[PDB]
RNA sequence: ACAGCUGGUUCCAAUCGAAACAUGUCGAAGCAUGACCUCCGCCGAGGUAGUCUGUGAGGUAGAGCGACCGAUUGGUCCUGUCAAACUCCAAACUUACAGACGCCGUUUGACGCGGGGAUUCCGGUGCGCGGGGUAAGCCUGUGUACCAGGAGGGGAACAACCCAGAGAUAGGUUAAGGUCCCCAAGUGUGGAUUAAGUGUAAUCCUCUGAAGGUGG
RNA sequence: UGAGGCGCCCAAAAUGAUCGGGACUCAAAUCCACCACCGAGACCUGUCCGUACCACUCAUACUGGUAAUCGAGUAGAUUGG
RNA sequence: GUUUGACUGGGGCGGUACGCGCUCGAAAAGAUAUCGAGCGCGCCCUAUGGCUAUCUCAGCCGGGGACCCGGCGAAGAGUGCAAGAGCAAAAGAUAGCUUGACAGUGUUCUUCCCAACGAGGAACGCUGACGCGAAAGCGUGGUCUAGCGAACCAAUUAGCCUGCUUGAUGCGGGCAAUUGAUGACAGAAAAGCUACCCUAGGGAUAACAGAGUCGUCACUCGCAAGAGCACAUAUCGACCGAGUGGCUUGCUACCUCGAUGUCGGUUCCCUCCAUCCUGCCCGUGCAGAAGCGGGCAAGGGUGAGGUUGUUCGCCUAUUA
RNA sequence: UUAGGCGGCCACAGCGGUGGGGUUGCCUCCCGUACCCAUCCCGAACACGGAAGAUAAGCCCACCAGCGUUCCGGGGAGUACUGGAGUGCGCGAGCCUCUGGGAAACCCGGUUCGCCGCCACC
């Protein structure tokens, strides 16, 4: 399961990619969604590619996110250990964060926006004008790579 | 053979065995085929189906296993031919065969011939066919009468010792008798 | 182009195929009674005669078959469509 | 008519005779010099290489051999050696000489189309490299900026 | 295109491998297809009879009864729904 | 008088939101019919802008031609070259249909049907692919995004270059870009090169600088 | 003797020279790395407004709720004032 | 009284890209422009149509560029005509027979991708009547894509409907269809001049100036064949190659058509350097004198006259 | 399939070559012209009638890779080309990096001298 950043706006970028982007929940710059490892994601992710950060976070990585951006389907109501525990199957946001990653459920399916709503990243990131292989921010990101740039935007 | 251009034909083409442009005409039917086809020898008779690998024959005849029936004559001979159709034509009709068109081959149309012969027996036979009856013999040839007759011009029998010497287009009629009404594998 | 003055072919009439006769239709005369002819004395006058003042107007440079294929038997004949031939000869 | 016209290989491949005539013929005289009788059984063997991909007029395929070949006769005009230039001006080349209307041009001449690295000039030495002098003035007189290549050759 | 004829820019699509000429195997001529199947459509080069418009090689309609011998498949061009009459040699079964 | 031509046509707000193209036209400064925009009524459960897989379509790039074809070297098999109107080969990619996932629709009725009303048929630019042309801030295609009709931030200024698509108001953090002063933020750190004020100039009509040369 | 980096020569134009200007040389240049910051109406966040939809309703009057998946716009269509 | 068309790197002349077909352009689905490249069609054919039978071609080899025999020979032959495609017990050749190149009426595709639009075209059926074949079957003209034409009117084909109170006759009107042309080819019946001109507009579009370009023009550089009695480089300097300028010319059509006053001259001001003189220098095929060539350099100077409106240029006498 | 008939895929099957096989199931060559039928001339062929002979052709069986073809390993080659992105480089032509794809020639070594279906049959 990877993490996936819209890092760059939608002004003149193709249509076809921007309609990816869409299907798979992202609407605007600095949204985040969770996706399943599978042929027709990695096919979506890769289309993307150049205005996305994405990789697979760490257990405690999501756990911050989750807490401090997940929300509900509908409403302001705060995704915590109790919200978690009273309104899906686990009991706390890190049963919940594990099944994520294990791909064994999805936000929605627990009553969760697909949205992760993300800050902007504290201290800034490293361009979106290269890849992460040459400074930038840009494709695919190291377990720890994608943890930086996740908590900085907590 | 010559190189990456060359165009080698079908098999069945360079085997001088099937005339494809007549096949194709032949299959538009959408009904089984009466192949006729002759040997030295014999004279064979299937009726061939079309099929999702290859012909499928739901029934066929042999002048061979024509003296199974109580041929004791030669059989590439018209009588020999007529006999096959209508044998494996009423074989065909106990397969549940009711109708077909004459494939003869590469065989040439020629009237009186021995694949008209078969087409005539398997008519006889039940079998409905698309023909014409002034291309087949009169009968009297189909009986064999037409090598009774050469027999008369004796001298030497025609037939190294076989059976009879005058030869029979009694034993013709005999057989198609038997044909006719009862029997095994019909 | 050639073609046979006579050869068996469908009559519509008879309703089966007999030997028919080609020819080349022969221009009818006009009697100058119909009503076009009566509007062209009626509507020229003074000045321009709008229509009736147009003159001919010209040749394509290949016509099409122009023929009346009569029946031999029942003598009724038929028109079939044309089609362009600089020139057409019959025959015998 | 200056280079600056032809040298680019922005234009389409036009090069068959069936559909062109007119064609001027090539000022290119020989395409193998020196001892032609002999084959490259040499020591030494320098090559020219163009650096980048252009189109050369038949007009500097002939100057340039010219100049490189003539210069050669420091050898000799029997001399033992042998020249190669591999390329052959098979572009056809246009000039529109009305305005932009109906524009195509008329046939004014032909072009060898090179790519960078490809060897254009390959010599035939024995340890006397003249041949590397004779280079030196020969991509003198073709567009691109070359190399001059020494391959069989560790008599250094 | 410099013409507007049916055959505009048909050079490679109805022309054969230098291998695959001459006459084809009648097997494929002789197919029968039922309402409702999916069928491909592609020219053969060598059986001149039965054709579609060149426009429509490639595509892969729905047989829908039959004309004659030849069969009515439906297509869609683009958004608008067509009709074209084909002979089973110029037809593949879908998968 | 008529004009298909120029000018003008007066209050507020909310929703949607183009076309500068195709066919016909004594037609190209105009129309009509389509495309496309919008409104209304009807239908009633699927739909398909993305990706994956399966079943099909294809001869462009490339490559090659002791595979056709036609070009194109030399020597006594060898040796030197090519193709928009060549192909023994052959992509990326585009594309028909189907399934899966995604997204979407069933009170926001999608997909589709019928009807009312248009506007529009001078377009432009960037990028990729082009064809013509010595070239052009050239002409003429094509796919796409933008300007037109697109604010705000940056780029000295500057329709289409970068960030960015924007209700009001307020706090905060970033983007492009920038941190010596003008001018918000570093006369930041480790190391190296340059002595020409090279340079302090992404892109560009706009920022030149070449072949050739250099014991700097 | 092979290669690479930066610079130099090649290098001529018309009212007053230029990198936006000042001016800069172990840089305020260039290349390799790195650290911390500044900086939009973007993104996050409080309140309000409009529009659409939902619940209640006679109501398009209130009240409550939903919008990550609503909020730019020439020609033009529609509608309230 | 009117007409005298459109397209078009302004318009005119030229051309027709004004109706059609093929290859390429066209970016491997489909669609796709230019006065884009190559080139065709406005017919011809009673067989050069249709079917059946028999058969296999170019070319080369061997035996007696005609003919005869054998062998190799997937196709280079032939198939009416462009181009591309198709075809070998055939779609080609030969022979024979035949008139389906038939009447009627449709389905569908095309014309017009998508996406509405006529004529025309094609594919595929049916009904009827036929041809050939043993038969399956083939024949809706030519293997496929060009060879085409509205309404009104006339002529023609077969049967029927109909014309004002009514009957007879004459002569009309109509249903279905064939033929006659509009090539500006989705169809007007159609020549020019205007500097005597007029109006509406356009910088949607030309002349002049500007702007972009730089083929042309001007100037420079690289290489240095060559000659220069010997000696490339005192001097001259080809070929080919790389550039700079924006003075000429051409191209483009961005700016102005509710006007940016023309050429040449003159007068008056500033500037550029690629320097003609002057200053300071280098080389010399530099004895001197007089030169030739080159470098730095724009302070100053660069004048008067004869022909011509001339710019330019030719000519005269002066001149550093 | 101890030899046959009709085929499907249509060179992995072609071209060329070696060896083996028949009082019989058989297929052929073969023998022969009164008939059906036949040669623009020939029972050559086509057609018909038939077994004295043969396994030499064909055919069937087993096998050979020199040519042609199919597929595969390794090398060429993650090269050539290319969908998406970049205030990366270059006077420019053009190039480079990241991401997703990915060839052709040719060389060397294997493979391939058909596979499969229905029917009939010591
Ligand atoms: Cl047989
Ligand atoms: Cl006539
Ligand atoms: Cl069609
Ligand atoms: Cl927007
Ligand atoms: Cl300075
Ligand atoms: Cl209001
Ligand atoms: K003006
Ligand atoms: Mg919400
Ligand atoms: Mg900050
Ligand atoms: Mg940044
Ligand atoms: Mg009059
Ligand atoms: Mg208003
Ligand atoms: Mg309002
Ligand atoms: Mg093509
Ligand atoms: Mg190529
Ligand atoms: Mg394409
Ligand atoms: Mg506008
Ligand atoms: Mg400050
Ligand atoms: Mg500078
Ligand atoms: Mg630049
Ligand atoms: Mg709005
Ligand atoms: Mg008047
Ligand atoms: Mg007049
Ligand atoms: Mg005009
Ligand atoms: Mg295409
Ligand atoms: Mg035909
Ligand atoms: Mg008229
Ligand atoms: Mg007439
Ligand atoms: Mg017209
Ligand atoms: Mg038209
Ligand atoms: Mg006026
Ligand atoms: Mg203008
Ligand atoms: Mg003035
Ligand atoms: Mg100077
Ligand atoms: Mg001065
Ligand atoms: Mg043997
Ligand atoms: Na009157
Ligand atoms: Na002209
Ligand atoms: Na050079
Ligand atoms: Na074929
Ligand atoms: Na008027
Ligand atoms: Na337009
Ligand atoms: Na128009
Ligand atoms: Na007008
Ligand atoms: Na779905
Ligand atoms: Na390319
Ligand atoms: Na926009
Ligand atoms: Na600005
Ligand atoms: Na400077
Ligand atoms: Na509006
Ligand atoms: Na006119
Ligand atoms: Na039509
Ligand atoms: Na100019
Ligand atoms: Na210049
Ligand atoms: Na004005
Ligand atoms: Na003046
Ligand atoms: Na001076
Ligand atoms: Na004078
Ligand atoms: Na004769
Ligand atoms: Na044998």
Same mark, same amino acid.
């Given at each position: 399961?990877?993490?996936?950043?819209?890092?760059?706006?939608?002004?003149?970028?193709?249509?076809?990619?921007?309609?990816?982007?869409?299907?798979?929940?992202?609407?605007?710059?600095?949204?985040?969604?969770?996706?399943?490892?599978?042929?027709?994601?990695?096919?979506?992710?890769?289309?993307?590619?150049?205005?996305?950060?994405?990789?697979?976070?760490?257990?405690?990585?999501?756990?911050?996110?989750?807490?401090?951006?997940?929300?509900?389907?509908?409403?302001?109501?705060?995704?915590?250990?109790?919200?978690?525990?009273?309104?899906?199957?686990?009991?706390?946001?890190?049963?919940?964060?594990?099944?994520?990653?294990?791909?064994?459920?999805?936000?929605?399916?627990?009553?969760?926006?697909?949205?992760?709503?993300?800050?902007?990243?504290?201290?800034?990131?490293?361009?979106? *004008?290269?890849?992460?292989?040459?400074?930038?921010?840009?494709?695919?990101?190291?377990?720890?790579?994608?943890?930086?740039?996740?908590?900085?935007?907590? | 053979?010559?190189?990456?251009?060359?165009?080698?034909?079908?098999?069945?083409?360079?085997?001088?065995?099937?005339?494809?442009?007549?096949?194709?005409?032949?299959?538009?039917?959408? *009904?089984?085929?009466?192949?006729?086809?002759?040997?030295?020898?014999?004279?064979?008779?299937?009726?061939?189906?079309?099929?999702?690998?290859?012909?499928?024959?739901?029934?066929?005849?042999?002048?061979?296993?024509?003296?199974?029936?109580?041929?004791?004559?030669?059989?590439?001979?018209?009588?020999?031919?007529?006999?096959?159709?209508?044998?494996?034509?009423?074989?065909?009709?106990?397969?549940?065969?009711?109708?077909?068109?004459?494939?003869?081959?590469?065989?040439?149309?020629?009237?009186?011939?021995?694949?008209?012969?078969?087409?005539?027996?398997?008519?006889?036979?039940?079998?409905?066919?698309?023909?014409?009856?002034?291309?087949?013999?009169?009968?009297?040839?189909?009986?064999?009468?037409?090598?009774?007759?050469?027999?008369?011009?004796?001298?030497?029998?025609?037939?190294?010792?076989?059976?009879?010497?005058?030869?029979?287009?009694?034993?013709?009629?005999?057989?198609?008798?038997?044909?006719?009404?009862?029997?095994?594998?019909? | 182009?050639?073609?046979?003055?006579?050869?068996?072919?469908?009559?519509?009439?008879?309703?089966?195929?007999?030997?028919?006769?080609?020819?080349?239709?022969?221009?009818?005369?006009?009697?100058?009674?119909?009503?076009?002819?009566?509007?062209?004395?009626?509507?020229?006058?003074?000045?321009?005669?709008?229509?009736?003042?147009?003159?001919?107007?010209?040749?394509?440079?290949?016509?099409?078959?122009?023929?009346?294929?009569?029946?031999?038997?029942?003598?009724?004949?038929?028109?079939?469509?044309?089609?362009?031939?600089?020139?057409?000869?019959?025959?015998? | 008519?200056?280079?600056?016209?032809?040298?680019?290989?922005?234009?389409?491949?036009?090069?068959?005779?069936?559909?062109?005539?007119?064609?001027?013929?090539? *000022?290119?005289?020989?395409?193998?010099?020196?001892?032609?009788?002999?084959?490259?059984?040499?020591?030494?063997?320098?090559?020219?290489?163009?650096?980048?991909?252009?189109?050369?007029?038949?007009?500097?395929?002939?100057?340039?051999?010219?100049?490189?070949?003539?210069?050669?006769?420091?050898?000799?005009?029997?001399?033992?050696?042998?020249?190669?230039?591999?390329?052959?001006?098979?572009?056809?080349?246009?000039?529109?000489?009305?305005?932009?209307?109906?524009?195509?041009?008329?046939?004014?001449?032909?072009?060898?189309?090179?790519?960078?690295?490809?060897?254009?000039?390959?010599?035939?030495?024995?340890?006397?490299?003249?041949?590397?002098?004779?280079?030196?003035?020969?991509?003198?007189?073709?567009?691109?900026?070359?190399?001059?290549?020494?391959?069989?050759?560790?008599?250094? | 295109?410099?013409?507007?004829?049916?055959?505009?820019?048909?050079?490679?699509?109805?022309?054969?491998?230098?291998?695959?000429?001459?006459?084809?195997?009648?097997?494929?001529?002789?197919?029968?297809?039922?309402?409702?199947? *999916?069928?491909?459509?592609?020219?053969?080069?060598?059986?001149?009879?039965?054709?579609?418009?060149?426009?429509?090689?490639?595509?892969?309609?729905?047989?829908?009864?039959?004309?004659?011998?030849?069969?009515?498949?439906?297509?869609?061009?683009?958004?608008?729904?067509?009709?074209?009459?084909?002979?089973?040699?110029?037809?593949?079964?879908?998968?």
């Amino acid at each position: 399961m990877h993490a996936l950043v819209q890092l760059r706006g939608e002004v003149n970028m193709h249509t076809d990619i921007q309609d990816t982007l869409e299907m798979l929940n992202i609407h605007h710059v600095n949204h985040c969604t969770l996706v399943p490892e599978t042929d027709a994601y990695r096919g979506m992710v890769a289309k993307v590619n150049d205005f996305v950060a994405f990789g697979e976070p760490s257990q405690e990585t999501l756990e911050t996110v989750l807490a401090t951006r997940a929300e509900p389907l509908e409403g302001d109501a705060d995704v915590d250990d109790e919200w978690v525990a009273e309104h899906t199957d686990y009991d706390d946001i890190s049963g919940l964060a594990f099944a994520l990653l294990s791909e064994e459920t999805t936000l929605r399916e627990q009553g969760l926006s697909p949205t992760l709503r993300l800050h902007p990243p504290r201290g800034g990131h490293d361009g979106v *004008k290269h890849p992460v292989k040459e400074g930038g921010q840009l494709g695919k990101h190291d377990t720890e790579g994608i943890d930086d740039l996740l908590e900085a935007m907590r | 053979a010559t190189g990456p251009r060359y165009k080698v034909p079908m098999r069945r083409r360079r085997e001088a065995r099937t005339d494809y442009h007549q096949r194709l005409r032949l299959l538009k039917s959408g *009904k089984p085929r009466l192949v006729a086809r002759k040997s030295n020898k014999h004279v064979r008779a299937q009726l061939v189906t079309l099929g999702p690998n290859g012909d499928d024959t739901l029934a066929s005849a042999h002048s061979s296993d024509l003296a199974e029936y109580g041929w004791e004559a030669p059989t590439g001979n018209m009588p020999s031919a007529y006999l096959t159709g209508l044998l494996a034509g009423l074989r065909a009709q106990e397969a549940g065969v009711e109708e077909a068109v004459l494939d003869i081959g590469l065989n040439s149309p020629t009237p009186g011939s021995k694949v008209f012969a078969i087409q005539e027996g398997a008519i006889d036979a039940g079998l409905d066919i698309p023909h014409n009856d002034d291309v087949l013999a009169d009968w009297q040839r189909t009986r064999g009468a037409h090598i009774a007759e050469y027999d008369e011009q004796l001298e030497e029998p025609l037939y190294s010792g076989d059976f009879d010497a005058a030869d029979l287009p009694e034993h013709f009629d005999e057989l198609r008798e038997t044909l006719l009404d009862g029997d095994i594998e019909l | 182009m050639q073609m046979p003055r006579r050869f068996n072919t469908y009559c519509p009439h008879c309703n089966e195929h007999q030997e028919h006769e080609v020819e080349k239709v022969r221009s009818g005369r006009q009697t100058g009674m119909k009503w076009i002819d009566r509007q062209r004395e009626r509507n020229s006058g003074i000045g321009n005669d709008g229509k009736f003042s147009k003159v001919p107007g010209g040749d394509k440079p290949t016509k099409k078959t122009d023929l009346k294929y009569r029946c031999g038997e029942c003598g009724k004949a038929h028109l079939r469509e044309g089609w362009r031939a600089g020139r057409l000869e019959f025959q015998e | 008519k200056p280079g600056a016209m032809y040298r680019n290989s922005s234009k389409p491949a036009y090069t068959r005779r069936e559909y062109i005539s007119g064609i001027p013929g090539k *000022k290119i005289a020989q395409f193998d010099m020196g001892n032609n009788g002999a084959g490259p059984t040499y020591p030494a063997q320098v090559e020219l290489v163009v650096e980048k991909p252009v189109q050369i007029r038949h007009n500097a395929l002939e100057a340039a051999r010219v100049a490189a070949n003539r210069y050669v006769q420091n050898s000799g005009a029997a001399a033992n050696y042998k020249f190669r230039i591999r390329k052959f001006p098979f572009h056809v080349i246009r000039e529109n000489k009305d305005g932009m209307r109906a524009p195509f041009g008329k046939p004014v001449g032909t072009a060898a189309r090179v790519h960078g690295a490809n060897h254009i000039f390959i010599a035939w030495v024995n340890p006397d490299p003249n041949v590397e002098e004779a280079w030196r003035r020969a991509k003198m007189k073709v567009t691109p900026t070359i190399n001059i290549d020494s391959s069989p050759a560790g008599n250094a | 295109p410099s013409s507007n004829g049916p055959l505009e820019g048909t050079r490679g699509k109805l022309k054969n491998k230098p291998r695959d000429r001459g006459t084809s195997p009648p097997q494929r001529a002789v197919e029968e297809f039922d309402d409702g199947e *999916k069928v491909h459509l592609k020219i053969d080069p060598s059986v001149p009879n039965g054709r579609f418009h060149p426009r429509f090689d490639g595509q892969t309609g729905t047989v829908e009864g039959k004309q004659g011998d030849a069969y009515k498949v439906d297509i869609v061009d683009g958004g608008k729904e067509k009709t074209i009459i084909v002979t089973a040699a110029h037809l593949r079964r879908q998968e």
